[PDB]
Design an enzyme around this catalytic site. Structure first.
Site, PDB file in Angstrom:
ATOM      1  N   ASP B  12       0.847  -1.382   0.256  1.00  0.00           N
ATOM      2  CA  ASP B  12       0.511  -0.472   0.377  1.00  0.00           C
ATOM      3  C   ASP B  12       1.096   1.582  -0.061  1.00  0.00           C
ATOM      4  OD1 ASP B  12      -1.797  -1.505  -0.526  1.00  0.00           O
ATOM      5  OD2 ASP B  12      -3.025  -1.093   2.130  1.00  0.00           O
ATOM      6  N   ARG B  92       2.153   6.640  16.406  1.00  0.00           N
ATOM      7  CA  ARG B  92       1.380   8.100  15.720  1.00  0.00           C
ATOM      8  C   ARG B  92       2.001   8.920  15.858  1.00  0.00           C
ATOM      9  NH1 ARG B  92       1.406   3.187  13.870  1.00  0.00           N
ATOM     10  NH2 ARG B  92      -0.494   2.442  13.252  1.00  0.00           N
ATOM     11  N   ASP B 121      -6.244   6.192  13.604  1.00  0.00           N
ATOM     12  CA  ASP B 121      -4.977   6.335  12.666  1.00  0.00           C
ATOM     13  C   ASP B 121      -4.425   8.248  11.643  1.00  0.00           C
ATOM     14  OD1 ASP B 121      -2.811   5.105  13.755  1.00  0.00           O
ATOM     15  OD2 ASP B 121      -3.464   3.550  12.342  1.00  0.00           O
TER      16      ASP B 121
END
EC number: 6.3.4.5
Lengths: 385, 386, 380, 382
Positions: B12, B92, B121
């Site tokens: 991805d 994150r 996210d």
């Protein structure tokens, strides 16, 4: 004068029964309650009559205990200081309630209990006694007498001809607690073979066992499809969990009276019910409601621990927890294996879960949400110039 | 233009990298951080150059991750909805921080991430980015592109020549996350053989193992008597707790953006650290301080979960938690055994525990007055009800 | 044996000084502190020597009081049960603090205070006393003597040469407190003329007066452009606020020990500071920080009220409140008129006052409404 | 296609009515409600028909507004950021509730409101709409249309035959808010004579007025001995407190959508009820219950402020607040004088107050136990 004593049949409450007679020269009505200690209360009732009681009552209170105390408390998700499931705390209120009802019926002005002056139990017995009957008199032999140690007490027993025989323990349908003795050294591990309600994980079955608990309205109503009464349901989960050695806690807790105490608890069925409940809540409760309920759980927990069961604060919070718990309807599937409980699945009639939202809102929406949420942070960064 | 991309080497993010070139015709700066995913971040770095990146940066951030993010969060006793130790959440911020920093150094107009449009996210990446650089431009391909399905994405990947191939995963020194696929049915147990960081209970050692953890000031500083850096200590505890199958959580959690979501997590080290800390706190923290801290933990937890790490509310609560943690000094002793973590002992140089007060400065009769004063309002209440 | 006594010069603490000497055959060291009562502390000091004190100390603690107790408490925006600004509560820790200190210096094993047996002050006094010095012995005459009544105490005083002179009181730079007498009937309005620190709002000036208060870091540092020390600043705002009758409270409060008590309080200066602080916070504090802070204030107020000042919990919360207060920098402009205080303006160097478009708002709405819609749908 | 519109009879909602018909090729059902804005709702209803509505509805919602929204909220002791009594916030859920009700009865697939695309009001309207009818279509013209200026909007209105007319206001039975214009400068005091619901304190009576408010069960039921319905009682206290200039607030509040805004509010009746309620609670509520309740009030306040009235959180808290409020039975005596409200007395049948259970010795034991952990802490710090 009449005194209603919470009689257990053991050495101490027996000594206490003789002491109340000599010290107050009153009639002592002994009261023993079956709340799941695994004891024949009629044996304590008869021993009470022999130790001198003028009357001795023995009631079966398993159902009331679980139904009116354990369950209401569980709906709140109450846990004291991270791990204590309040096994001893919710029990005391029930007993005091009965001591006062009995005294009321017997025309007794006082009630007595065998809890020491250094613990929470004295407060639990008394706070509920005064809350239910404000003019009741309370005698706490441990805070009044002169015995300066065990030896003196054994002697007083023999002197009065009373049957006589590491750590002490309290037991009921919800759990067994162990305290004192070798346990007072917080760096010392509970001795081998101390536990009685749960089996040793090292001796637990080599094959996991699955169990399912259904909740209808905030309370567990069936286990593996079989509908069981509150006390019957807790008993079943103690058997299933105990066999796997589930529910062992070893903690240094803060007593209400001011000091720290090392405690060890085993709550097999209660520990399964704890996780089963949350599993069902994960599908039935709204996010914000859950987040708010969880922030109030700790407070409710200390209310119970300290002895404020029949206090307006707890009954107020209870109205909140019950409102939320009303939606906890569904089934939890748990996997028990060597001292552990694993939630492996849950389902609910009105679950709020839908794998399609994760499979009414689209990409662009998420963007605007982020912008609006980030505004105050950006203005801050900008102003921090 | 220049765009700093959080590139992991995966399919991805590789597709995204190509997409950023084709769409924005921008110079793409790939960024890969090793926060303990168990991959060779260097390979990802070389792949990025191979995929089109005009520059590839690979950093070892294990230490910064555990000392500046994991540790501060643990001090607060953070637990989202009773079981989640926030393994994905605290990571994150760290990444967004560096994306923004790299973008400034490189004179890049924007940064980009590979978080989907349905998760948290994206929120986590962007709240941090906007908080650190309000003027930053953010590009979220998953929200901007037209692809629909893994079929289309693989085609497009095949087209451009990007190497091509049950559940989704996310890993770092704190944990490994599993969700989606066969995991979407809340009534379905996870599939045997999914866990990677933890040995399976049924296969854990037959003999229990004891481990000791020392806390000097709110932070774990050693294991079994050996001083270890934050990252090496978490690593060590993942190994010890992992071989015993410790720290597996299976919950349906409430998302900030979507509705509910079934997640499975394994946090071997963190789970040991969670019970160890509380064991040392049981001797070093005051009753009323502990009860108050526990009432604030849940709020701190959702703050971390929602992505508000570099937000004023979290920094404020952090002051309260850091103040309280400064007292947590001592050693916890735990018995690990087949998926479980048992506290069996604890000790502290400044322990508030006194056996003298419990065994048979304390006068029994004082309790009676304590009780009567406490009972007053209750007796008045009854009397008024008559 | 020595005993340090909180001596105010009054009839009871004087009787107590005699009682201690006789009852404990002890040398009594008297301690009187000026925290803004409006009395000449030196006269109490001299009277203590006359009454039998083996020594008398009189200290001016007005600055320490405001800067180390009043100010930190204000940063927390603490209000007990909706209205009480805690004037009596934040003063006791300071007194007990010195009693213990002086006791250490004088080699005294005990200290004593004149708080009654059913009140809360005895708790405040002793909680901080035991917290600062766990080995200290405390003597609370009201709980230990036999006096069957006023008449009897008066005769005791006369017999000892103590001069014998409708409601109890307590005053300091923060406020003046009134209770007892006519005030014990919660349905009876306080009598006309009872108030001392504030002008009757019905007799306040016909023209409103504007005031500006500057905050630098959580603490007020100036009034109407003039920099003033902590005690000097509270004094000034009591003058300005008092002349207008600002800061009057009439509540039935919940005691820590007893049941409910009816009290009247006047806190002219602190009342102005209360609204001035929030006015500055309205431009400098972040929305989420402010909301969390306000949800913690009540708990803090409760800690102060009960007497848990030198307790770890209050100090833990203090770290949070102080952290937040650090951003409170700016000027609040108020308008005072007949008993009332009106915020009329505010400015700050780092104000957050005056990003997204309409389409951004819709997405925000959709995401927020999602769980609500699902719930509605599920109720089928 | 049918669209139920929250129509006020003003220029913008009239323009929106025309805009809706043409933009969506649908008919508009106009909804006007009287919640105490002091306007003749029947005229807005007739103007709607004149402006093109296929059906105009006008309802008197004063009693429902006070009984089901204001009262429930007051029992919670809700105050937003120290001073805001939430006059605008509790009114929206009521209006949206009727828009979705009228839509269901009229077979309208959508509803519309005239809230701006950058404010908090839009969120209030839509959150309750979606919560009550998840499939409802909500049309917000301010977020959708292309008008680029005030001038263009006037030309459009004149073109469509719609009549055309230092701060903007909003009024209902609970209050009147003011914002914008000269009010945007937080350092500037509000202009003279701006207030409408309350007399200026400088012009208030020289004689103070005493007021007694009876609470039976958490809700006010009587003023000075006279029993009054919820809307009638709020009206009465607005008249009394208003004459004395009571209930003025001037604050810079934090918005849900956007940053901060400077608002001025006058809530005479609600301000009296606020103190009156606490006065009765001071005698009827248990200490621990009161302390817990006050710690939850702020949370409830932001829920109402953000627009989460018909949200499960709010209703869960409401279960707590209502449980507590049920004990609030008694009478509060207040004194009103030139802008201020003073509690001068309170009484109750179940008062827990006795000017009068323990002795001195008890007090000492209490102190000892309470102090133990503190003493231990000191010894340890050596």
């Amino acid at each position: 004068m009449k005194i209603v004593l919470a009689y257990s049949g053991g050495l101490d409450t027996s000594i206490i029964l003789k002491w109340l007679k000599e010290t107050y020269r009153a009639e002592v009505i002994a009261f023993t309650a079956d709340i799941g200690q695994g004891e024949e209360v009629e044996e304590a009732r008869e021993k009470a009559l022999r130790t001198g009681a003028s009357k001795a009552i023995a009631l079966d209170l398993k159902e009331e205990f679980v139904r009116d105390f354990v369950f209401p408390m569980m709906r709140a998700g109450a846990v004291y200081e991270g791990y204590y499931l309040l096994g001893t705390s919710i029990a005391r209120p029930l007993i005091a309630k009965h001591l006062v009802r009995i005294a009321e019926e017997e025309g007794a002005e006082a009630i007595a209990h065998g809890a020491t002056g250094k613990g929470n139990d004295q407060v639990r017995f008394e706070l509920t006694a005064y809350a239910l009957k404000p003019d009741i008199k309370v005698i706490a032999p441990w805070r009044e007498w002169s015995f300066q140690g065990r030896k003196e007490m054994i002697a007083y027993a023999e002197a009065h001809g009373i049957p006589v025989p590491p750590y002490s323990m309290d037991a009921n349908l919800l759990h067994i607690s162990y305290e004192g003795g070798v346990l007072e050294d917080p760096w010392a591990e509970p001795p081998k073979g101390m536990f009685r309600m749960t089996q040793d994980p090292e001796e637990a079955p080599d094959a996991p066992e699955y169990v399912e608990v259904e909740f209808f309205e905030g309370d567990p109503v069936a286990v593996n499809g079989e509908r069981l009464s509150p006390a019957a349901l807790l008993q079943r989960l103690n058997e299933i969990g105990g066999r796997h050695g589930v529910g062992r806690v070893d903690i240094v807790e803060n007593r209400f009276v001011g000091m720290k105490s090392r405690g060890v608890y085993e709550t097999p069925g209660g520990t399964i019910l704890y996780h089963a409940r949350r599993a069902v809540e994960s599908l039935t409760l709204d996010r914000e409601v859950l987040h708010q309920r969880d922030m109030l759980s700790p407070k409710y927990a200390e209310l119970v621990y300290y002895g404020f069961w029949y206090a307006p604060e707890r009954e107020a919070l209870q109205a909140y927890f019950d409102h939320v718990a009303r939606s906890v309807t569904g089934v939890a599937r748990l996997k028990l294996y060597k001292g552990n409980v694993y939630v492996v699945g849950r389902k609910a009639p009105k679950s709020l879960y839908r794998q399609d939202l994760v499979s009414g809102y689209d990409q662009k929406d998420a963007e605007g949400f982020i912008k609006i949420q980030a505004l105050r942070l950006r203005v801050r960064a900008l102003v921090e110039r």
